[PDB]
Write a protein that binds this ligand. Structure first.
Ligand SMILES: *[C@@H]1O[C@H](CO)[C@@H](O)[C@H](O)[C@H]1NC(C)=O
Ligand SMILES: *[C@@H]1O[C@H](CO)[C@@H](O)[C@H](O)[C@H]1NC(C)=O
Lengths: 50, 49, 49
């Protein structure tokens, strides 16, 4: 198709902050009562999410 | 109509985790946010005396 | 006796090794205790005695 949107508004991509979001399990590995820490492709805290 | 959805970008950060008895992630602590978070990741504990 | 989520397979210890597992064929929680207990101690008196 080529029909445009009816009410497409030309709005800028505004910004909010990822507070504690984006905390995933790094693998399929169970832990218990430990304070593990590692590096992987994370969602950075408090950054501009669109 | 009224609908909201947010977009985040994945970056190679470094986090601290805390597991409970049941093994869920209870708390998440960043490393490279401020020198306080750097300190919490350096001591391998988020309870700095 | 832990809470394995169905994707969670490998239990890790504080020493970051393999602790608790699950058979990929049959869903079951297991626990591992390593072998090779300790060493050899020899008690003897004096040979001339
Ligand atoms: C988001 O971007 C704006 C400029 O586009 C900047 O002023 C603001 O500080 C950013 N937010 C954060 C949390 O850094
Ligand atoms: C673990 O799960 C059980 C199931 O109800 C719950 O009673 C218990 O409080 C949980 N423990 C933790 C540390 O989350």
């Amino acid at each position: 198709q080529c029909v445009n949107l009816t009410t497409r508004t030309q709005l800028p991509p505004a910004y909010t902050n990822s507070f504690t979001r984006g905390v995933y399990y790094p693998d399929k590995v169970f832990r218990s009562s430990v304070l593990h820490s590692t590096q992987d492709l994370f969602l950075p805290f408090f950054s501009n999410v669109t | 109509g009224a609908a909201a959805y947010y977009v985040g970008y994945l970056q190679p950060r470094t986090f601290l985790l805390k597991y409970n008895e049941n093994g869920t992630i209870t708390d998440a602590v960043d490393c490279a946010l401020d020198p306080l978070s750097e300190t919490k990741c350096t001591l391998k504990s988020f309870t700095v005396e | 006796n832990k809470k394995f989520l169905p994707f969670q397979q490998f239990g890790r210890d504080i020493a970051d090794t393999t602790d608790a597992v699950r058979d990929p064929q049959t869903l079951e929680i297991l626990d591992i205790t390593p072998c090779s207990f300790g060493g050899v101690s020899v008690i003897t008196p004096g040979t001339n005695t």
